[PDB]
Design a binder for this molecule. Structure first.
Ligand SMILES: [Ca+2]
Ligand SMILES: [Ca+2]
Ligand SMILES: [Ca+2]
Ligand code: NA
Length: 209
């Protein structure tokens, strides 16, 4: 027991670890010195709490790495308790903690302001009349949404309506004639500039005599 291990820092800090970091990514290196000779000065590294199944420490190297995927939107930061135990009886311990905070990156989809949208209009509505407004909210809270009609929205309905790529306001583009169509189901995509499979909503437009 001549002395116990002392880490080089009380709290280690890794700030802005990318949440989309891959498995095995280097997080931070800890180090506890023990100036006893032989096995009394040889320390074994271990996490006691706080990693929540996302981090693993090398017992010998003291390197911490990730061990599955991270998520800013599920947990923004981690505080792990680490021990260093010397290699001979009586296995004296030393202690630190490790603070990891995550960098929010654009890896999530988008929510809309309702389940769907509806508009009831009359024939021969003037051009550029506002019909309804689609609005959506980047889950990631990084980007603004851009709005467009999806690929499968019909030529006929692309001729009659236009959505604003910024405001998401749908306006009258051409002349709505009842006999040509009294009801339209539009599909609006909200793009966040991100990866995800496209977030869409329905707009149901009804035309009256
Ligand atoms: Ca010792
Ligand atoms: Ca995320
Ligand atoms: Ca994110
Ligand atoms: Na998003």
């Amino acid at each position: 027991n001549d002395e116990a291990p002392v880490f080089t820092q009380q709290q280690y800090n890794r700030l802005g670890l990318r949440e989309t970091a891959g498995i095995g990514t280097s997080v931070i290196v800890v180090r506890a010195t023990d100036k006893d000779t032989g096995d009394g000065g040889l320390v074994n590294y271990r996490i006691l709490s706080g990693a929540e199944g996302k981090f693993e420490i090398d017992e010998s190297t003291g390197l911490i790495v990730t061990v599955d995927y991270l998520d800013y939107e599920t947990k923004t930061s981690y505080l792990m308790n680490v021990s260093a135990t010397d290699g001979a009886p009586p296995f004296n311990q030393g202690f630190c903690s490790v603070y990891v905070t995550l960098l929010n990156e654009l890896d999530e989809a988008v929510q809309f302001s309702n389940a769907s949208y509806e508009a009831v209009i009359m024939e021969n509505l003037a051009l550029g009349t506002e019909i309804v407004r689609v609005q959506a909210y980047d889950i990631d809270n990084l980007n603004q949404i851009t709005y467009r009609f999806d690929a499968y929205t019909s030529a006929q309905a692309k001729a009659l309506f236009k959505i604003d790529a910024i405001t998401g306001v749908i306006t009258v583009k051409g002349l709505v004639d009842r006999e040509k169509g009294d009801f339209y189901t539009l599909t609006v995509v909200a793009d966040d500039g991100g990866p995800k499979v496209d977030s869409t909503v329905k707009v149901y437009i009804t035309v009256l005599d």
